[PDB]
Amino acid sequence: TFSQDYVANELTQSFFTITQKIQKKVTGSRNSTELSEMFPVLPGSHLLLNNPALEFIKYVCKVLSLDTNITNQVNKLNRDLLRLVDVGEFSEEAQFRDPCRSYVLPEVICRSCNFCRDLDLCKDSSFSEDGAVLPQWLCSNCQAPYDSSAIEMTLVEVLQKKLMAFTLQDLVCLKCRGVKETSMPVYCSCAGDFALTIHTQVFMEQIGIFRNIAQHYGMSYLLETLEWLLQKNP
Amino acid sequence: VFGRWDETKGEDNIDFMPTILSRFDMIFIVKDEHNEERDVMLAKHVITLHVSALTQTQAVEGEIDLAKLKKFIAYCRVKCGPRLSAEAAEKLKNRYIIMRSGARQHERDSDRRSSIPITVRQLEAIVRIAEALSKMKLQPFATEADVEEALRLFQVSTLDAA
Amino acid sequence: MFVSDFRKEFYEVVQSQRVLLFVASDVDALCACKILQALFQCDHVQYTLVPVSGWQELETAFLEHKEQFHYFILINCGANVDLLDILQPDEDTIFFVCDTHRPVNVVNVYNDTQIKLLIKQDDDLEVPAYEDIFRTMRRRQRREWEARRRDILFDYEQYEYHGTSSAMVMFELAWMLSKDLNDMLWWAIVGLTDQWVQDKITQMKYVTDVGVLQRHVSRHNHRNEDEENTLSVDCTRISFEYDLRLVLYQHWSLHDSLCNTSYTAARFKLWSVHGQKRLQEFLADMGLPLKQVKQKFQAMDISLKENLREMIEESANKFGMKDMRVQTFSIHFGFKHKFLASDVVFATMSLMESPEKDGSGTDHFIQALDSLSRSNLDKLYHGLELAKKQLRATQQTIASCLCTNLVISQGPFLYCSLMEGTPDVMLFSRPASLSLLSKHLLKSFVCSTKNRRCKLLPLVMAAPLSMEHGTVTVVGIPPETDSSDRKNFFGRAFEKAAESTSSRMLHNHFDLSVIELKAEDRSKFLDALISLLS
Amino acid sequence: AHARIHLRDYVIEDDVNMAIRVMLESFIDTQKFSVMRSMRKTFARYLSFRRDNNELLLFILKQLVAEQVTYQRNVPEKDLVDKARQINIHNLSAFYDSELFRMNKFSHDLKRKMI
Amino acid sequence: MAPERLRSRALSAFKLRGLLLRGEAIKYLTEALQSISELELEDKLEKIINAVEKQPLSSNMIERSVVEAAVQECSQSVDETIEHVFNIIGAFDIPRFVYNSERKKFLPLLMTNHPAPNLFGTPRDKAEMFRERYTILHQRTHRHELFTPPVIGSHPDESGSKFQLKTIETLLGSTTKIGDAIVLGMITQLKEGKFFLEDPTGTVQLDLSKAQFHSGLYTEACFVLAEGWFEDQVFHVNAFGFPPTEPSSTTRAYYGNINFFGGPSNTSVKTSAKLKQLEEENKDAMFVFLSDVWLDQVEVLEKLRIMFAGYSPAPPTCFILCGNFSSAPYGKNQVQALKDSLKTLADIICEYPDIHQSSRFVFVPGPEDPGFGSILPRPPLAESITNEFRQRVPFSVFTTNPCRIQYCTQEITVFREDLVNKMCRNCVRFPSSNLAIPNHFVKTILSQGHLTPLPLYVCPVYWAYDYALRVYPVPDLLVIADKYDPFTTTNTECLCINPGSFPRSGFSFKVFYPSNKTVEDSKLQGF
């Protein structure tokens, strides 16, 4: 239990040194057109990653803040290293966010082993497999693949039924919080305005998920449907 | 009455008589509702406002200066006196009947007279609110849209009496 | 090539032609443009006038206009770069260059056919010889010649500075054409006073050019007036003045002008809490009542206005301000209109560098250019109001920087920076006003500090430019000393530091000592500058 | 008010920290006695009970001394405060009145400026 | 002719009419007019200036393109044209008009504050659909003979030809047991069995114990004139009826010849003398209409070969193939099968080059075909499917469902959906059998003025594009492609037809002649 503090002091030294090392080396890298270009892009990637020492600090501190309840020294390291980078705590850029838009296709069945399992299409390390993504999309009973053709068609079908859910959604007034009863009103029983039950940004996020999935896995028919769905927008 | 508006106590939060409440065209119960997003944006606005006490008192886009707004109000007051259009008056008539029926049924359901009344003064209040909206635009008549905005404002002021 | 005679081999050429004026957004350029406009309008020359403020803008306008015009005039731009390389023109076009920037690029100097320079050959010029710049033991001799070439070219291009005013050059042309009006002479005076106000020239050169313009003022006055019978009060009357250095003191209260003049503010440390008491010591030495000093100058008692200049001079002498009086000019017309040349400079500059987010910088240029004509006198007065606001904001920024100690030594140069969202950083986002602020701030700093070494340092100053692109403007100022030549090396220093760092520097401004940087690049860029200046 | 107490013409981060501390300690005092523990932890950890920041200056001093000793073998107080005015740690006086540099055998003198 | 005098006179001719030519325009004009002298030059200049002014000029300054179009029109080049004579308009291309009540006029959206339509509509737009449907039917209703009499039109007052109208909010008041109330509103089963009426002012219960209903197939979301009396927050219906339908002649006589149908023409194409002539330039101007063309079947392909054999003599201007193109629409399988279908169709079309060069081929995909089938207006079939057919048969256009076809002065609407079954299942009152169901359906569609007079979950629609489904004013053809039954009907100078479903009609289909507006049966069942 108490050895958390000892390693915390050891990290108070080492983490400082390591942040200085990566800071001075990455900022001096002449191949950086912008430091945002430095980061790798996976099908789950959405964040505007910008300043590698900061992302490194954030991710390290996230795991350290969750692998013990004794977060006090981790919080102190956050304060010290964010000030060493000269970026403010309590800012948006200092907040951790999951770099991956995780998206799961559940209960994918394999005939090679007669087994069903859930599949995340954004999580996987597309750089190391590309065409081998389908072997990487193995059934966990075995190592047998799931195929690109049927999965692309499944994603398009998912998009169709999702867009149906959006187009037939309910609407809720922002003041009398019940659902919109009839087609007549622009304002509800009280004069509050209405709001979506299925917000547009849910669909922009899921469209971005499927777009990056299709881009990293070369799914051109899904990209046709997505390109049309993106064009007819505000 | 209890400092903050206490929703459990209902009409006891108001000590004003019905007779003086009827004379107010619009009654706002502006409750201070806690919310983190509004609080963050409000605090940022306040702090930037306090910082902006040194920046030469510059004007802002999409805004009228205070002096120009004052003179414009004086000009519109002396010049334009609007009236209601006929169909707009018909709309206001019907909506007044629905509103009065709602108030009566609410009072019957509570078995207690509401603190804030809804009367002919409130009808005329909606009338002159619509006329004020028309006078902003120097129009001789108040349209159905002007009456609609007047109804919207009075509905905000009437949700505040529910 | 240098034009030897403006009349024959420039003006009589373009007089028969359609012309395109490119004009920089600075007051000297505006005055030269007004003089040349008046000449062309007398002779019905079909000119087109285009404002520009950077190389990208000049390139865009030239690409838009290259097909239709063959004769181009560049005012306060183009001399210090290779115009053929930058613009890529057709060989039948001709570029006239009336630019105060120095040193002139050697390609522009020795290009005989296409680039013609409306620059005085008796200006301070040290162009290297042609054989030094343009083309086994023979290979060794050639390599030695190339080593000589790079050494001499670096010695030539190290320091940038400014020559004679373009407005003065254009008024010289107008005088040679015998079409010089009194208003043209006033524009020439304002053009010189722009250089003096912005400290682009030495005091000796300013006194020499004022001595030149004194003769023209005397000629214009005696053209149609003497001491026995005089002109109408409506006519413009330009008078030489040995007047006060204080800014806009005839349109302000004297308290405000003593507050916001960089000279007196730096001397008395009026940013500091003790400075107001020092100012009160000065005023009590003069014996001026405070209720009169804080009253507007036009409403001040004439008994006090009778000999105010001698009073201020003789009190300034014993308080240590040795050069309070300055040689300058004023213009009078009508009953109530009276301006100093410095006043017109500040008004036009404030109109041009106005912080309003309306239209475009070309729009602000247009307002500034219109204000230089007496048919648009209301614009001149509005510019004086904007100058009041600008000077107050300048002193507020200087006080903030010195109180919070943003100005900090970094070895061979002082460094300062303005943070986003601070009060009135918007007014100094634009590069020209930033350069002026940096000069005033450095004067205040060297007057404030006790450290004799720090009094000798130059200044580097930065401010935000575009948050969406994540960029900052940066300017470099030489050391502020009484006997400075007003030469600075920060153009080549910025260039060499950026190249040695592979930095994302956009070099868009006409002064080489003004640049744009991607913001995160600043740390390695500043480290490179420190290692370079050593 | 804290800036006025220090005769500062401009408000700094230390004054803001003091104001935040005053507000939060008063608010914690208004809570029930059982609730003060959870409330105090909530505000103290995240919301800027900025007691001291000695560790950054300790390792800055140690880094500068390591580089200087390495350079010497193959005015350090000025070298210390230069990096302290570069990074947002400008109130260096706490570091000199704290034991962290003392048990690392560092010391200060306003005349000699050696450490 | 002298170039300097030609330039000067051309510039003067445009200048006196108040028009400025750019340098390119005047240069091109002088080159075009170089072959003309004073016996013809000034008349030519006046003619081409009139041709310029006829165009939608946005400014006095003229670019080279406008004078190009003008002088080319002066030089004809429109002989045997297909442009101006035959257009296919996608549903997303239809102009978005909005009826303004105070002006009592349809305004295009550029002249208003209305935003552009998009798929991800606001909460307002979902209500705006039904509000605008009510608005169009309301302004339709009040122009009927039911309107109030003029100033002492009758010595005793009359109640709007005994059809005086009111809204819901008016009768929610003093009018209890008034025996002559008539209200326009939407039928809704707002509670189960307890039907309600709704209009933009409010709602009220419907006691429909007696219906006395006129002919027409009543469903939920149908707008009706409810005639009855009001008591106890219930409207006791005496009779139900739809609003009367207008002919397009009446609508355009009232509002002028606005191009509600869409397309290049600024005016309604039904009023144009030149286009009236170009319609009849071919006496046997002709079109063919089919549906559910299952080209994933070899039988359909072989029968199509025989149909091309049968219509080698007198080929159409265009073949119209409505969607549900497949026996088996079941995904990747059908994506590849439709690629094979179009490859084989291109083979067949190249085996009849005369029909290839004489006729066009357009496709209106159904809800079951691959892509965004299930929500209307459907986008066209996926371009990756069409690509080989695009390059091998350039004489073809894949388009949206519904799509609007114009042939000269006549208006054709094409829409693939099995809507009769949907309508009868969502029926509120089982109709009288004395009138046939396609006639019921067509009367309902025309009176409701909409292709989808059903709830949104029954007919999913992108909310802001609901105007594209509107049938207003009544066109020349309602080509409602539906499995139910091939048919032909008519009302209000429209012929409302169904080509059926080609595998289930015994491979029967329809033929149309706009030169006389006649319709013939391709009865080619044994072919």
UniProtKB/Swiss-Prot annotation, chain A:
Residue positions binding Zn(2+): C110, C113, C139, C142
Domain of life: Eukaryota
Zinc finger (CysA-type): 110-142
Binding annotation for [4Fe-4S] cluster: C173, C176, C188, C190
Motif CysB motif positions after renumbering to this chain: 173-190
Subcellular location: Nucleus
UniProt disease link: Colorectal cancer 12: A complex disease characterized by malignant lesions arising from the inner wall of the large intestine (the colon) and the rectum. Genetic alterations are often associated with progression from premalignant lesion (adenoma) to invasive adenocarcinoma. Risk factors for cancer of the colon and rectum include colon polyps, long-standing ulcerative colitis, and genetic family history. CRCS12 is characterized by a high-penetrance predisposition to the development of colorectal adenomas and carcinomas, with a variable tendency to develop multiple and large tumors. Facial dysmorphism, immunodeficiency, livedo, and short stature: A syndrome characterized by mild facial dysmorphism, mainly malar hypoplasia, livedo on the skin since birth, and immunodeficiency resulting in recurrent infections. Growth impairment is observed during early childhood and results in variable short stature in adulthood.
Record's comment describing the protein's domains: The DNA polymerase activity domain resides in the N-terminal half of the protein, while the C-terminus is necessary for maintenance of the complex.
Family: Belongs to the DNA polymerase type-B family.
Record protein name field: DNA polymerase epsilon catalytic subunit A
Species for this entry: Homo sapiens (Human)
UniProtKB/Swiss-Prot annotation, chain C:
InterPro entries given in the database record: CDC45 (IPR003874)
Outcome after substituting S232Y: In MGORS7; uncertain significance
Native source organism of the sequence: Homo sapiens
GO terms (BP aspect): DNA replication checkpoint signaling; DNA replication initiation; double-strand break repair via break-induced replication; mitotic DNA replication preinitiation complex assembly
Protein family: Belongs to the CDC45 family.
Gene Ontology CC entries for this record: centrosome; ciliary basal body; CMG complex; DNA replication preinitiation complex; nucleoplasm; nucleus
Gene of this entry: CDC45
Disease linkage: Meier-Gorlin syndrome 7: A form of Meier-Gorlin syndrome, a syndrome characterized by bilateral microtia, aplasia/hypoplasia of the patellae, and severe intrauterine and postnatal growth retardation with short stature and poor weight gain. Additional clinical findings include anomalies of cranial sutures, microcephaly, apparently low-set and simple ears, microstomia, full lips, highly arched or cleft palate, micrognathia, genitourinary tract anomalies, and various skeletal anomalies.
Keyword Repressor attributed: no
Any one GO molecular-function label of the UniProt entry: DNA replication origin binding
Subcellular compartments: Nucleus; Chromosome
Taxonomic lineage of the native organism: Eukaryota, Metazoa, Chordata, Craniata, Vertebrata
Subunit structure: Component of the CMG helicase complex, a hexameric ring of related MCM2-7 subunits stabilized by CDC45 and the tetrameric GINS complex. Associated with ORC2. Interacts with HELB.
A Pfam family annotated for this UniProt entry: CDC45
Impact upon substituting D194G: In MGORS7; decreased protein level
Effect listed in the UniProt record for changing A266V: In MGORS7; decreased protein level
Top-level taxon of origin: Eukaryota
Keyword Cell cycle: yes
Modification sites for Phosphotyrosine: Y130
UniProtKB/Swiss-Prot annotation, chain D:
PTM note: Phosphorylation by the CDC7-DBF4 complex during G1/S phase is required for the initiation of DNA replication.
Compartments where located: Nucleus; Chromosome
Signal peptide region: none
Domain of life assignment: Eukaryota
Additional comment: Early fractionation of eukaryotic MCM proteins yielded a variety of dimeric, trimeric and tetrameric complexes with unclear biological significance. Specifically a MCM467 subcomplex is shown to have in vitro helicase activity which is inhibited by the MCM2 subunit. The MCM2-7 hexamer is the proposed physiological active complex.
Function: Acts as a component of the MCM2-7 complex (MCM complex) which is the replicative helicase essential for 'once per cell cycle' DNA replication initiation and elongation in eukaryotic cells. Core component of CDC45-MCM-GINS (CMG) helicase, the molecular machine that unwinds template DNA during replication, and around which the replisome is built.
Pathological association: Deafness, autosomal dominant, 70: A form of non-syndromic sensorineural hearing loss. Sensorineural deafness results from damage to the neural receptors of the inner ear, the nerve pathways to the brain, or the area of the brain that receives sound information. DFNA70 is characterized by slowly progressive, postlingual hearing impairment.
Family of this protein: Belongs to the MCM family.
Protein's UniProt name: DNA replication licensing factor MCM2
Region of the whole protein represented: 776 to 900 of 904
Swiss-Prot record, chain E:
Keywords recorded for this protein, A-Z: DNA replication, DNA-binding, Nucleus
GO CC field: epsilon DNA polymerase complex; intracellular membrane-bounded organelle; nuclear body; nucleoplasm
Entries under InterPro entries matching the protein: DNA_pol_a/d/e_bsu (IPR007185), DNA_pol_e_bsu_N (IPR024639), POLE2 (IPR016266)
UniProt key word Nucleus: yes
Main location, first listed in the record: nucleus
GO molecular function, one term: DNA-directed DNA polymerase activity
Domain of life: Eukaryota
GO biological process: DNA repair; DNA replication; DNA-templated DNA replication; error-prone translesion synthesis
Keyword check for Nucleus: yes
Annotated compartments: Nucleus
Quaternary structure and interacting proteins, as annotated: Component of the DNA polymerase epsilon complex consisting of four subunits: the catalytic subunit POLE and the accessory subunits POLE2, POLE3 and POLE4.
Family, as annotated: Belongs to the DNA polymerase epsilon subunit B family.
Note: In eukaryotes there are five DNA polymerases: alpha, beta, gamma, delta, and epsilon which are responsible for different reactions of DNA synthesis.
Functional description taken from the UniProt entry: Accessory component of the DNA polymerase epsilon complex. Participates in DNA repair and in chromosomal DNA replication.
Protein name: DNA polymerase epsilon subunit 2
Source organism of this protein record: Homo sapiens (Human)
Name of the gene this protein is made from: POLE2
